[PDB]
């Protein structure tokens, strides 16, 4: 199996240098091509460039003099560097394997052909937001259960920046009936989401329901227990 | 810029992307599920990798003067997503930007009753001199709702924060409505309500202090 | 004045353009307002003159130019030459005859066989095959200034194509006259080429060298090399196929060295529209563009070889 | 062809044009057709 995982800062100041890393598991980084793809909110994906061993590396002409790619054969991962970042670079950066192909239309010998690239195995992707504002830690508040034989239960992540926030229940021991809603950008410039779980009312237990809230840009991990 | 294609279930869907062909092409197609990462569907005009059914076919890159076409036979609700294409023309430079995507709409979903849930402010937040009402809206189709808060029988003008609808690998759209109040405001009125207007119906759930 | 640019394609820097997208002014039917129309000329047809790149027709500084009518064709048809009354044409019917000397078996005819006037260089196309062994004819073999006409016994299959779906733009330079320009190209930008079966060419060349040793010593080394240089009509295989005038690189046919004892050979072919054949000055013909991909299959029935003076004669 | 009315000669978009010489006349004169010897 081929698993790809992206990881970065999440928040980068203007006119700075963005640094990203694609942790690869299941294959070696030397026997494959590696490409990076970013995509702004509500726009089409933009190819950043591909990197390969033996010096075979090309970049995007529009971002030619700002981007830098590399391959760590010792740590088995893919890196990315973008100097002089702006608000236009705010997007979702993906890491995907790349297989090459050769389209022949002419007589081959007269170089009447061209090589095309295509990504088959993508990664989960990382979120990168460019803003001159500081990072703020979220404040988790428990949502008490209230009402058929069924009952509702959830948590609340209030005032944080920037996106996103990963929320799990009982360290991942509850994936049935979980619905995490997208956050809302308030006028203050802080996001706020919520996540509820549909559970049977029969929970005298105490069947301890602990939601796990994680915020990478602030390195914040808060474990909150919800009780009626 | 955005385009839409609606096709009845079980029928055939057709998708157009990129400019007209000028030379021999090698069109690469991609599918992007909402909230997920783009996945490979068809590379080299009409060559599908492992895991992709033969229902998905693309126009050959040997026809000069035609646009790239993605044909989807036996359209199902799972095929409802965005589709991008990467044009590789022998007359055009390397495109570092995918073509404008096309949204596939699977008709006859058809209707879905919204599941609203209203939560009162937490005891921990009230100690921080803050209060916030939460109205969770899910499992509703189509994604177009309007939320109006109520103080007893009087409507609430300000303090209302509502998210925009967003489907998640289903007919289920998501929407959250927040109402920022003060600890004094909460204990004031008798009860608050969360009236959600979807399509033609309006569901109302209330909440009372203790 | 032609404001030309590169044809629509995608690099490399080694593609050297070749095809030019020229835009220029033109006289309409009326003698007032002009006409801003564009055409597509080959690099061999144009030449720059000193803002963007401005060119001109390669013949404008040499002679006048007239366009060949699209009604007529340059397809070589058999022509029998006959002698009037009181005259006769004698025909030598021996299988071995170098064109000079007494003929044992002589016959008379009124009209010669159908001889197609195929205008070509280096490679003799669609000619009469020789009998038995391939023949070697020369006015003076000892003289390296005299050409050596070769005649084949078994024909060498040659295939030439024009992989470019051209478009004929008919701009009107009235009243009456009309110029046929070259429109945009439908499909891929490819260059003309000629294929020669490697197997056939190897046997034919080896069959000729065995005849060359009968005149240059039994145990000698025969080496083949490409042209020395000069005009394009001399250094390349000039011929006509489908109305176009090809100019092919023959460095792949004469690249060998013969001692005393499975695919096709592709040849780079250029195409010129403005020509001046028969070393004629004053009359330049502009060959009109041809729609669609052109294909032609011909017979290589002979060669026109020349020998060097560097000698070292009794050796190679 | 499309300020006042501007025109053109009706043949300018069809073919070239040459003026008939005023010296010659288009008056039909009797012409006897004859056959050569042996005919
Ligand atoms: C003078 O001499 C020179 C040199 O000798 C000569 O130059 C030659 O010119 C020709 C034409 O001008 C040129 O042909 C081209 O070749 C392209 C490559 O073909 C070769 O590779 C393929 C695949 O190999 C790859 O994949 C292998 C795994 O499968 C892998 O192991 C390889 O390493 C490699 O990666 C191979 O299949 C071909 O074999 C053919 O030839 C064999 C005989 O030698 C024959 O036995 C085979 O069966 C096969 O012939 C066909 O077989 C079936 C039918 O039975 C067809 O379905 C196949 O497609 C085969 O054609 C070669 O070894 C080739 O891709 C080019 O054809 C594409 O491009 C043109 C122009 O754009 C289109 O019009 C074509 O329709 C075709 O487009 C299809 O393919 C591309 C690429 O895959 C796709 O992107 C397209 O979308 C399209 O595919 C779709 O549409 C079709 C429509 O029907 C559909 O059927 C498909 O299912 C699909 O949905 C083109 O033919 C040749 O390269 C060149 N050089 C040499 C050395 O020959 C001059 O011509 C000579 N001049 C003269 C005058 O004589
Ligand atoms: C050495 O000898 C060989 C053998 O003779 C010779 O090969 C010949 O090549 C020429 C090309 O230069 C061929 O001529 C053309 O052939 C095509 C294809 O013919 C097909 O159709 C016929 C049926 O009619 C079939 O029998 C045949 O097998 C093919 O399938 C024709 O389409 C061409 O026609 C055009 O040109 C003619 C003369 O130029 C015109 O009279 C005719 O009207 C066509 O002109 C116009 O056509 C269109 C209108 O219909 C118009 O749109 C076009 O723009 C164009 O203006 C042409 O006949 C010839 O057939 C080959 N010989 C044989 C036996 O097939 C080599 O060329 C020769 N080598 C050298 C150096 O000369
Ligand atoms: C050699 O050089 C010549 C230039 O002299 C080239 O000729 C030009 O080719 C270009 C193609 O790239 C032509 O540009 C196109 O013009 C079209 C004409 O528009 C018509 O339609 C509109 C309504 O939409 C009318 O209002 C108008 O009056 C015309 O009737 C445009 O429609 C084209 O737009 C398309 O392409 C653009 C590209 O960005 C897209 O964004 C659009 O959405 C649309 O798809 C296009 O702009 C140009 O007109 C030609 N000029 C001449 C004088 O012919 C040759 O192509 C070139 N040849 C080679 C081989 O290099
Ligand atoms: C449009 O034209 C441009 C020409 O500028 C072309 O981009 C070029 O692509 C070639 C490869 O197709 C690049 O050349 C590479 O150079 C590196 C060294 O830096 C080599 O290691 C590469 O070798 C690999 O690729 C070969 C391709 O055939 C393989 O055969 C080989 O096995 C290796 O895998 C390769 O030679 C060149 O650097 C770029 N040029 C630029 C400016 O980017 C582009 O592909 C063309 N696009 C289309 C659609 O025609
Ligand atoms: C190119 O060369 C080939 C030779 O390989 C030519 O094919 C040959 O054409 C001749 C006619 O020019 C054929 O001769 C005929 O033979 C029959 C047999 O009975 C006879 O009845 C006829 O009167 C005529 O003499 C010959 O058979 C044929 N070769 C083969 C193998 O069929 C071809 O015509 C040449 N192409 C040109 C000159 O364009
Ligand atoms: C075709 O002719 C026109 C004239 O109508 C040219 O346009 C003029 O170009 C000159 C320089 O070449 C400028 O100084 C003028 O201002 C232009 N406009 C006029 C005279 O109205 C045009 O450049 C010509 N195109 C060619 C030669 O490709
Ligand atoms: C007409 O123009 C052509 C092309 O510019 C001239 O051909 C050049 O002749 C010189 C002779 O000294 C060569 O060095 C060049 O290489 C030739 N150019 C090309 C493109 O081959 C030709 O001499 C001109 N004729 C004149 C001025 O009478
Ligand atoms: C030149 O072209 C001719 C025909 O255009 C080729 O003859 C063909 O050879 C193939 C075998 O590869 C046969 O399947 C066809 O039936 C033949 N066609 C005819 C009309 O006989 C010939 O092989 C080509 N030669 C080269 C060197 O390209
Ligand atoms: C004949 O072939 C030789 C190669 O053996 C050609 O020599 C080359 O000429 C080019 C000039 O275009 C030089 O760049 C190369 O360095 C030369 N190669 C060698 C090995 O000397 C020569 O040009 C050819 N001549 C003709 C008329 O085709
Ligand atoms: C004909 O072909 C020969 C060889 O295929 C060409 O010679 C090449 O010339 C280029 C420079 O123009 C050199 O870079 C190559 O190294 C040469 N090839 C060889 C094998 O030496 C020649 O240019 C072609 N064209 C003409 C007109 O001769
Ligand atoms: C004639 O053919 C020979 C091959 O028999 C060519 O030799 C090439 O030489 C160069 C270096 O001198 C090598 O890099 C090539 O690999 C050789 N070719 C092959 C096929 O091995 C020679 O270049 C040819 N001459 C011309 C003028 O094309
Ligand atoms: C070259 O392009 C022309 C069009 O630019 C092609 O002509 C078409 O031919 C098909 C059938 O062959 C007809 O159905 C179309 O109506 C034609 N179009 C026009 C505008 O006439 C021609 O086929 C192309 N050449 C080749 C070899 O495919
Ligand atoms: C040249 O101009 C004449 C006159 O405008 C054109 O004749 C016209 O032809 C059309 C055919 O559709 C008729 O409907 C008109 O009635 C004709 N006009 C007159 C005055 O009779 C002729 O077609 C033109 N020739 C071209 C453009 O080649
Ligand atoms: C990638 O994973 C390795 C261990 O597998 C870890 O040491 C490294 O920190 C990871 N990369 C990033 C950027 O966290
Ligand atoms: C045309 O292409 C050649 C390729 O060598 C390049 O040198 C030249 O600058 C190009 N000219 C234009 C106008 O694109
Ligand atoms: C042929 O050339 C040689 C020397 O090149 C000369 O001596 C002789 O007179 C020429 N003519 C012949 C042999 O008929
Ligand atoms: C075939 O050609 C090769 C060179 O291309 C040559 O070495 C060989 O001797 C040839 N074979 C014959 C039988 O002439
Ligand atoms: C060359 O030698 C061959 C024998 O290998 C012989 O048949 C031929 O007649 C000789 N040619 C001469 C002597 O001119």
XYZ file of N, CA and C in Angstrom, chain C residues 70-217:
444
model
N -3.506 25.853 -60.970
C -3.951 24.666 -60.235
C -4.668 23.660 -61.131
N -4.970 24.063 -62.360
C -5.651 23.187 -63.306
C -4.715 22.112 -63.848
N -3.481 22.502 -64.152
C -2.494 21.572 -64.689
C -1.819 20.772 -63.582
N -1.202 19.657 -63.960
C -0.490 18.815 -63.008
C 0.911 18.495 -63.516
N 1.833 18.260 -62.589
C 3.209 17.946 -62.947
C 3.453 16.441 -62.907
N 2.436 15.674 -63.284
C 2.532 14.219 -63.285
C 3.134 13.719 -64.594
N 4.323 13.104 -64.515
C 5.044 12.600 -65.689
C 4.299 11.474 -66.401
N 3.877 11.727 -67.635
C 3.187 10.723 -68.436
C 4.076 10.259 -69.591
N 3.965 8.974 -69.970
C 4.779 8.384 -71.041
C 4.685 9.143 -72.361
N 5.837 9.480 -72.932
C 5.890 10.196 -74.202
C 6.741 9.451 -75.223
N 6.113 9.038 -76.320
C 6.816 8.337 -77.386
C 7.375 9.325 -78.404
N 8.679 9.256 -78.646
C 9.314 10.103 -79.650
C 9.371 9.391 -80.993
N 8.878 10.051 -82.034
C 8.827 9.442 -83.357
C 9.571 10.261 -84.407
N 9.977 9.594 -85.483
C 10.680 10.245 -86.579
C 9.776 10.357 -87.800
N 9.862 11.487 -88.522
C 9.036 11.721 -89.713
C 9.365 10.775 -90.864
N 8.612 10.885 -91.955
C 8.805 10.027 -93.119
C 10.197 10.201 -93.717
N 10.787 9.095 -94.158
C 12.123 9.121 -94.721
C 13.172 8.898 -93.651
N 12.748 8.989 -92.397
C 13.635 8.759 -91.266
C 13.214 7.508 -90.507
N 14.078 7.055 -89.605
C 13.789 5.889 -88.785
C 14.615 5.931 -87.509
N 14.148 5.232 -86.482
C 14.872 5.162 -85.221
C 15.328 3.734 -84.950
N 16.637 3.547 -84.822
C 17.191 2.226 -84.564
C 17.237 1.954 -83.064
N 16.998 0.703 -82.685
C 16.962 0.327 -81.278
C 17.895 -0.840 -80.980
N 18.797 -0.644 -80.024
C 19.735 -1.689 -79.632
C 19.070 -2.646 -78.651
N 19.049 -3.932 -78.988
C 18.339 -4.910 -78.167
C 19.234 -5.951 -77.502
N 20.478 -5.590 -77.211
C 21.344 -6.489 -76.456
C 21.169 -6.225 -74.963
N 21.339 -7.265 -74.154
C 21.124 -7.148 -72.717
C 22.292 -6.443 -72.034
N 23.443 -6.436 -72.696
C 24.624 -5.762 -72.170
C 25.155 -4.742 -73.172
N 24.988 -3.465 -72.845
C 25.407 -2.382 -73.727
C 25.631 -1.103 -72.931
N 26.854 -0.585 -72.976
C 27.200 0.612 -72.216
C 26.891 1.905 -72.969
N 26.024 1.812 -73.973
C 25.588 2.981 -74.715
C 26.514 3.409 -75.836
N 27.735 2.884 -75.839
C 28.722 3.256 -76.850
C 29.377 2.034 -77.489
N 29.509 2.065 -78.811
C 30.120 0.970 -79.542
C 29.155 0.288 -80.494
N 29.629 -0.752 -81.196
C 28.810 -1.511 -82.148
C 27.769 -2.386 -81.451
N 26.581 -2.494 -82.039
C 25.511 -3.299 -81.459
C 25.211 -4.529 -82.311
N 25.318 -5.724 -81.707
C 25.072 -6.998 -82.395
C 23.623 -7.163 -82.851
N 22.677 -6.930 -81.947
C 21.263 -7.087 -82.266
C 20.565 -5.735 -82.393
N 20.440 -5.252 -83.625
C 19.816 -3.960 -83.884
C 18.447 -4.123 -84.535
N 17.476 -3.347 -84.064
C 16.138 -3.351 -84.643
C 15.673 -1.922 -84.901
N 14.740 -1.753 -85.833
C 14.229 -0.426 -86.155
C 12.798 -0.230 -85.671
N 12.488 0.996 -85.259
C 11.145 1.352 -84.813
C 10.769 2.735 -85.327
N 9.474 3.035 -85.328
C 9.008 4.347 -85.754
C 8.893 5.276 -84.551
N 8.432 4.721 -83.435
C 8.271 5.482 -82.201
C 8.918 4.752 -81.030
N 9.669 5.487 -80.215
C 10.305 4.909 -79.038
C 9.257 4.552 -77.992
N 9.661 3.793 -76.980
C 8.745 3.405 -75.913
C 8.342 4.621 -75.085
N 7.316 4.455 -74.258
C 6.828 5.537 -73.425
C 7.859 5.992 -72.413
N 8.477 7.138 -72.679
C 9.488 7.685 -71.782
C 8.932 8.845 -70.963
N 8.726 8.601 -69.674
C 8.206 9.622 -68.773
C 9.286 10.634 -68.412
N 9.023 11.920 -68.684
C 9.970 12.994 -68.370
C 10.006 13.321 -66.879
N 10.605 12.437 -66.088
C 10.714 12.646 -64.649
C 11.945 13.478 -64.309
N 11.720 14.700 -63.839
C 12.816 15.590 -63.475
C 13.263 15.342 -62.040
N 14.468 14.803 -61.885
C 15.012 14.519 -60.563
C 16.535 14.528 -60.571
N 17.126 14.557 -59.381
C 18.578 14.550 -59.246
C 19.036 13.406 -58.349
N 20.322 13.075 -58.436
C 20.934 12.014 -57.633
C 20.278 10.647 -57.839
N 18.985 10.553 -57.549
C 18.262 9.295 -57.690
C 17.359 9.292 -58.922
N 17.619 8.369 -59.843
C 16.786 8.219 -61.031
C 15.482 7.516 -60.666
N 14.358 8.188 -60.900
C 13.059 7.659 -60.497
C 12.191 7.226 -61.675
N 11.460 6.129 -61.477
C 10.528 5.596 -62.469
C 11.136 5.410 -63.857
N 12.325 4.821 -63.911
C 13.003 4.601 -65.175
C 12.951 3.155 -65.629
N 13.615 2.868 -66.746
C 13.651 1.516 -67.292
C 14.718 0.673 -66.606
N 14.319 -0.504 -66.136
C 15.230 -1.411 -65.448
C 16.189 -2.080 -66.427
N 17.404 -2.352 -65.965
C 18.415 -2.981 -66.804
C 18.202 -4.489 -66.884
N 18.931 -5.133 -67.789
C 18.832 -6.574 -67.970
C 19.979 -7.286 -67.263
N 19.678 -8.438 -66.668
C 20.668 -9.261 -65.972
C 21.405 -8.472 -64.890
N 22.692 -8.228 -65.113
C 23.494 -7.445 -64.180
C 23.195 -5.959 -64.335
N 23.333 -5.205 -63.247
C 23.137 -3.761 -63.303
C 24.207 -3.142 -64.196
N 23.838 -2.091 -64.920
C 24.742 -1.502 -65.898
C 25.417 -0.236 -65.384
N 26.645 -0.010 -65.840
C 27.403 1.185 -65.489
C 27.855 1.900 -66.757
N 27.419 3.144 -66.924
C 27.732 3.900 -68.130
C 28.397 5.237 -67.812
N 29.429 5.573 -68.580
C 30.145 6.832 -68.407
C 30.831 7.244 -69.705
N 30.884 8.547 -69.962
C 31.527 9.063 -71.165
C 33.037 8.854 -71.093
N 33.580 8.985 -69.889
C 35.000 8.769 -69.647
C 35.228 8.367 -68.194
N 35.428 7.074 -67.967
C 35.615 6.546 -66.621
C 36.903 7.070 -65.990
N 37.944 7.211 -66.807
C 39.228 7.719 -66.333
C 39.120 9.177 -65.899
N 38.179 9.900 -66.498
C 37.948 11.295 -66.149
C 36.996 11.408 -64.962
N 37.482 11.986 -63.867
C 36.673 12.140 -62.663
C 35.725 13.333 -62.751
N 35.741 14.016 -63.892
C 34.868 15.163 -64.112
C 33.593 14.741 -64.831
N 33.599 13.527 -65.369
C 32.433 12.989 -66.060
C 31.575 12.163 -65.109
N 30.265 12.384 -65.159
C 29.334 11.669 -64.293
C 29.221 10.196 -64.665
N 28.808 9.382 -63.699
C 28.650 7.949 -63.913
C 27.190 7.538 -63.751
N 26.506 7.333 -64.871
C 25.101 6.948 -64.843
C 24.940 5.465 -64.536
N 24.198 5.170 -63.475
C 23.961 3.796 -63.055
C 22.528 3.386 -63.376
N 22.347 2.154 -63.841
C 21.013 1.633 -64.116
C 20.780 0.351 -63.327
N 19.648 0.282 -62.634
C 19.349 -0.856 -61.771
C 18.629 -1.986 -62.497
N 18.755 -3.192 -61.953
C 18.041 -4.356 -62.461
C 16.782 -4.592 -61.638
N 16.943 -4.579 -60.320
C 15.818 -4.691 -59.404
C 15.527 -3.322 -58.801
N 14.276 -2.859 -58.923
C 13.898 -1.531 -58.430
C 13.910 -1.449 -56.909
N 14.339 -0.308 -56.379
C 14.346 -0.089 -54.940
C 13.115 0.713 -54.532
N 12.231 0.083 -53.766
C 10.985 0.714 -53.349
C 11.239 1.921 -52.455
N 10.751 3.082 -52.879
C 10.905 4.304 -52.097
C 9.539 4.931 -51.803
N 9.336 5.331 -50.551
C 8.074 5.929 -50.129
C 8.262 7.322 -49.545
N 7.566 8.303 -50.111
C 7.666 9.677 -49.634
C 6.299 10.231 -49.244
N 6.245 10.926 -48.111
C 4.991 11.496 -47.631
C 5.133 12.933 -47.147
N 3.998 13.619 -47.061
C 3.944 14.986 -46.562
C 2.954 15.047 -45.406
N 3.419 14.718 -44.193
C 2.565 14.654 -43.002
C 2.109 16.025 -42.506
N 1.386 16.758 -43.345
C 0.856 18.067 -42.975
C -0.421 18.395 -43.742
N -1.559 18.326 -43.058
C -2.838 18.649 -43.680
C -2.952 20.153 -43.912
N -2.434 20.610 -45.049
C -2.405 22.033 -45.368
C -3.758 22.589 -45.794
N -3.896 23.907 -45.693
C -5.118 24.597 -46.085
C -4.820 25.627 -47.170
N -5.655 25.660 -48.202
C -5.463 26.599 -49.298
C -6.316 27.854 -49.133
N -5.676 28.955 -48.753
C -6.354 30.244 -48.688
C -6.313 30.910 -50.055
N -7.483 31.241 -50.587
C -7.564 31.861 -51.901
C -7.855 33.353 -51.801
N -6.843 34.133 -51.429
C -6.996 35.581 -51.362
C -7.088 36.141 -52.778
N -7.904 37.174 -52.951
C -8.199 37.690 -54.281
C -7.425 38.960 -54.620
N -6.444 38.824 -55.505
C -5.719 39.973 -56.028
C -6.320 40.344 -57.377
N -7.584 40.752 -57.355
C -8.305 41.068 -58.574
C -7.813 42.321 -59.271
N -8.435 42.660 -60.410
C -9.527 41.874 -60.994
C -9.026 40.719 -61.862
N -9.543 39.520 -61.613
C -9.174 38.356 -62.396
C -8.201 37.424 -61.700
N -7.003 37.926 -61.416
C -5.967 37.123 -60.772
C -6.352 36.731 -59.348
N -5.807 35.612 -58.885
C -6.077 35.119 -57.540
C -4.897 34.311 -57.012
N -4.433 34.660 -55.816
C -3.289 33.988 -55.209
C -3.722 32.917 -54.215
N -3.076 31.757 -54.285
C -3.385 30.654 -53.385
C -2.372 30.567 -52.250
N -2.736 31.127 -51.102
C -1.864 31.124 -49.933
C -1.997 29.824 -49.154
N -1.134 29.650 -48.159
C -1.191 28.479 -47.294
C -1.823 28.855 -45.959
N -2.966 28.252 -45.652
C -3.664 28.536 -44.411
C -3.019 27.860 -43.219
N -3.773 27.736 -42.132
C -3.270 27.067 -40.938
C -3.164 25.567 -41.184
N -2.317 24.902 -40.407
C -2.105 23.468 -40.562
C -2.964 22.667 -39.590
N -3.738 21.730 -40.128
C -4.602 20.891 -39.310
C -3.864 19.650 -38.821
N -3.570 19.608 -37.527
C -2.907 18.458 -36.942
C -1.547 18.766 -36.351
N -0.626 17.818 -36.487
C 0.709 17.954 -35.920
C 1.694 18.554 -36.916
N 2.662 19.304 -36.401
C 3.707 19.878 -37.237
C 4.803 18.847 -37.473
N 4.727 18.169 -38.611
C 5.715 17.160 -38.970
C 6.425 17.535 -40.266
N 7.599 16.951 -40.482
C 8.388 17.237 -41.673
C 8.324 16.090 -42.675
N 8.482 16.423 -43.953
C 8.429 15.430 -45.022
C 9.596 14.454 -44.921
N 9.377 13.223 -45.369
C 10.415 12.203 -45.299
C 10.254 11.134 -46.374
N 11.343 10.425 -46.652
C 11.332 9.333 -47.619
C 11.909 8.058 -47.011
N 11.226 6.938 -47.229
C 11.675 5.659 -46.693
C 12.235 4.724 -47.753
N 13.383 4.133 -47.447
C 13.997 3.136 -48.311
C 14.273 1.878 -47.500
N 13.733 0.751 -47.954
C 13.926 -0.521 -47.267
C 15.409 -0.860 -47.148
N 15.885 -0.925 -45.907
C 17.289 -1.187 -45.608
C 17.784 -2.477 -46.257
N 16.913 -3.478 -46.316
C 17.262 -4.764 -46.907
C 17.480 -4.647 -48.414
N 16.581 -3.936 -49.086
C 16.655 -3.769 -50.535
C 17.852 -2.918 -50.947
N 18.099 -1.849 -50.197
C 19.178 -0.923 -50.521
C 20.552 -1.549 -50.303
N 20.646 -2.454 -49.335
C 21.913 -3.109 -49.032
C 22.331 -4.060 -50.147
N 21.357 -4.767 -50.711
C 21.623 -5.708 -51.793
C 21.916 -4.981 -53.099
N 21.192 -3.892 -53.341
C 21.353 -3.122 -54.569
C 22.710 -2.428 -54.617
N 23.101 -1.808 -53.507
C 24.390 -1.130 -53.426
C 25.539 -2.125 -53.548
N 25.371 -3.293 -52.936
C 26.380 -4.335 -52.990
C 26.461 -4.974 -54.362
N 25.396 -4.822 -55.141
C 25.348 -5.364 -56.491
C 26.025 -4.404 -57.465
N 26.045 -3.125 -57.103
C 26.677 -2.100 -57.925
C 28.192 -2.105 -57.740
N 28.634 -2.223 -56.490
C 30.059 -2.192 -56.170
C 30.800 -3.368 -56.813
N 30.088 -4.469 -57.040
C 30.671 -5.628 -57.703
C 30.910 -5.334 -59.180
N 30.171 -4.364 -59.711
C 30.332 -3.942 -61.096
C 31.368 -2.828 -61.197
N 31.567 -2.112 -60.096
C 32.532 -1.019 -60.058
C 33.960 -1.550 -60.008
N 34.126 -2.744 -59.447
C 35.443 -3.360 -59.352
C 35.895 -3.900 -60.704
N 34.963 -3.989 -61.646
C 35.286 -4.447 -62.991
C 35.936 -3.334 -63.807
N 35.956 -2.127 -63.248
C 36.526 -0.976 -63.940
C 37.621 -0.290 -63.126
N 37.614 -0.505 -61.814
C 38.576 0.149 -60.931
C 39.485 -0.843 -60.209
N 39.716 -1.999 -60.822
C 40.546 -3.023 -60.216
C 39.720 -4.010 -59.413
